Amino acid sequence: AGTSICTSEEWQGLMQFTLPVRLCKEIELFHFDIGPFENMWPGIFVYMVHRSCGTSCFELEKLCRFIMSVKKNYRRVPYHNWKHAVTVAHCMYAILQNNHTLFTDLERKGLLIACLCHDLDHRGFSNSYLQKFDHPLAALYSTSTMEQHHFSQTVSILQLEGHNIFSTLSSSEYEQVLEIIRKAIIATDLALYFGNRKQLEEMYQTGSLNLNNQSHRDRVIGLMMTACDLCSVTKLWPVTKLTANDIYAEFWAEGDEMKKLGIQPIPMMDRDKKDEVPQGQLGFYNAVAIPCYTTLTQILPPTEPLLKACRDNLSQWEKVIRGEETATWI
Numbered sequence: 001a002g003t004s005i006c007t008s009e010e011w012q013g014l015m016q017f018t019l020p021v022r023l024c025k026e027i028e029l030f031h032f033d034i035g036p037f038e039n040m041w042p043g044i045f046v047y048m049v050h051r052s053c054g055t056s057c058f059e060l061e062k063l064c065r066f067i068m069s070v071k072k073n074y075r076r077v078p079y080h081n082w083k084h085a086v087t088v089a090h091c092m093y094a095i096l097q098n099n100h101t102l103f104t105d106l107e108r109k110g111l112l113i114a115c116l117c118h119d120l121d122h123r124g125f126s127n128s129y130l131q132k133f134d135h136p137l138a139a140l141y142s143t144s145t146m147e148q149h150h151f152s153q154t155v156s157i158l159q160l161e162g163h164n165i166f167s168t169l170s171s172s173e174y175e176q177v178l179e180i181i182r183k184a185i186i187a188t189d190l191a192l193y194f195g196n197r198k199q200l201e202e203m204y205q206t207g208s209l210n211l212n213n214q215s216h217r218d219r220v221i222g223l224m225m226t227a228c229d230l231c232s233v234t235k236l237w238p239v240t241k242l243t244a245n246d247i248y249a250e251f252w253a254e255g256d257e258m259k260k261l262g263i264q265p266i267p268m269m270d271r272d273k274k275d276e277v278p279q280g281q282l283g284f285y286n287a288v289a290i291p292c293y294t295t296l297t298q299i300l301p302p303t304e305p306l307l308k309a310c311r312d313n314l315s316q317w318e319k320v321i322r323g324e325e326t327a328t329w330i
């Protein structure tokens with residue numbers, strides 16, 4: 001019930017944070033894993049906003065309140081949590097730094113914020129679940145159910161006293177950035193991804209893709225959102241493999257609920273079907289991750305290291321299937 005708000009101690013502490021100097025170099029690389037630096041995550045986000053958008057872009061106190069309240073509105077679920085938020089924001093930073101002048105100041109600020117907020121108040125349940133069992137959210141939001149909710153949660157946090165980091169935009173730019181954020185969050189609905197990628201592939205291959213065309217820009221930003229949302233698959237193998245453990249902890253807890261309601265879950269959500277996980281991952285990389293990074297690399301060549309890493313992880317899942325797996329810790 002309701003929107004959580006950070007404490008005075010929380011945001012003032014973030015204000016004083018300084019990013020250890022060794023990390024400045026690493027944070028620029030696509031493969032950077034925030035995993036080992038949990039105390040630093042909010043500070044890492046501040047640093048990225050300041051590098052991409054400038055130290056003056058947002059009033060610092062409002063930005064620190066906003067970030068710490070966002071953190072407090074992610075739930076203690078295994079995967080769709082604060083760590084995932086910051087990981088996705090970092091991928092977006094790396095894409096923006098590598099393609100900086102393709103995007104406007106307003107787009108960079110909107111997209112970094114959109115990434116941090118994109119899974120706000122996730123409960124650990126899929127759109128499939130909310131709609132199968134008529135959760136009130138599915139009645140309010142007939143499609144892209146959770147994504148519409150995440151955007152509503154974002155607006156709710158902006159509306160908290162002292163939290164509106166966008167208030168200094170002109171009335172026009174304010175409307176525009178909220179629309180950038182809305183479209184970007186909605187785009188994280190993987191249901192929309194398949195259509196988006198196919199459209200972009202066609203536009204690219206025929207030569208009609210045009211970044212001065214707003215609808216084209218929206219679609220490219222959409223695919224950037226997918227690429228960032230799934231970026232666990234572009235990390236080093238042990239990081240990818242550990243993250244998969246968290247994703248599945250979430251899926252299996254959902255499957256357990258569907259069994260109580262008399263429906264056998266899809267195998268992916270069935271904790272009694274872990275043997276199917278490697279082939280499930282192969283299917284996901286072939287159907288979703290590989291095509292995504294493939295298209296993103298055609299459109300934004302500097303993003304190629306994401307595709308190379310995704311291919312390397314596809315190879316690792318193939319190794320698992322062939323029984324070649326070596327020692328893993330979890």
Ligand SMILES: O=[N+]([O-])c1ccc2[nH]ncc2c1
Pocket residue numbers: 190247280281284
């Ligand atoms: O759609 N998803 O939520 C989702 C996300 C990541 C995934 N990895 N493997 C399957 C899979 C499904």
Ligand code: NI
Pocket residue numbers: 118119146188
């Ligand atoms: Ni999501």
Ligand code: NI
Pocket residue numbers: 084088118119188229
């Ligand atoms: Ni997500």
